[PDB]
Amino acid sequence: NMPVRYFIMKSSNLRNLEISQQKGIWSTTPSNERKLNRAFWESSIVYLVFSVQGSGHFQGFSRMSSEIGREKSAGLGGVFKVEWIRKESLPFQFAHHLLNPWNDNKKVQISRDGQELEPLVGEQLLQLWERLP
């Protein structure tokens, strides 16, 4: 199906993003492990766009590089590989015009953790980083 899907990932604080950016890993809730995996196999590329909660920035975006091994068998459970593409902060003002038809046409800036972006609008969301060096 969909050759590219996009998802918003929220962080509780910026240190976690700093860990992800340097170690190249992420981990998320289980509600979202099932969603992200089925997306990993179906789509050619899954993009994760990041935002610390209540920070007023997206802190960059990454591609999802592995699956979320939840072997039947805490303890680095549910950690997966991410490949950051852009690590520069983008204020919400640059995206205010961008609306998510899959989230009640609300602004993409208003997304729960793991919210999938409609592909056209995900695509433009990524093009805004080209403004930033």
UniProtKB/Swiss-Prot annotation:
Residues involved in RNA binding: K10, S11, S12, W26
Residues of the full protein shown: 1285 to 1422 of 1430
Domain YTH: 4-129
Entry text on domains: The YTH domain mediates RNA-binding. It recognizes and binds N6-methyladenosine (m6A)-containing RNAs.
Name of this protein: 3'-5' RNA helicase YTHDC2
Function noted in UniProt: 3'-5' RNA helicase that plays a key role in the male and female germline by promoting transition from mitotic to meiotic divisions in stem cells. Specifically recognizes and binds N6-methyladenosine (m6A)-containing RNAs, a modification present at internal sites of mRNAs and some non-coding RNAs that plays a role in the efficiency of RNA processing and stability. Essential for ensuring a successful progression of the meiotic program in the germline by regulating the level of m6A-containing RNAs.
Species the sequence originates in: Homo sapiens
Summary of subunit composition and partner proteins: Interacts with MEIOC; binds transcripts that regulate the mitotic cell cycle inhibiting progression into metaphase, thereby allowing meiotic prophase to proceed normally. Interacts (via ANK repeats) with XRN1. Interacts with ZCCHC4. Associates with the small ribosomal subunit. Interacts with RBM46.
Localisation per UniProt entry: Cytoplasm; Cytoplasm, Perinuclear region
Entry similarity comment: Belongs to the DEAD box helicase family. DEAH subfamily.
Tissue spec. comment: Expressed in testis. Not detected in spermatogonia next to the tubule wall but is strongly expressed in spermatocytes, suggesting that it is up-regulated in germ cells upon entry into meiosis.
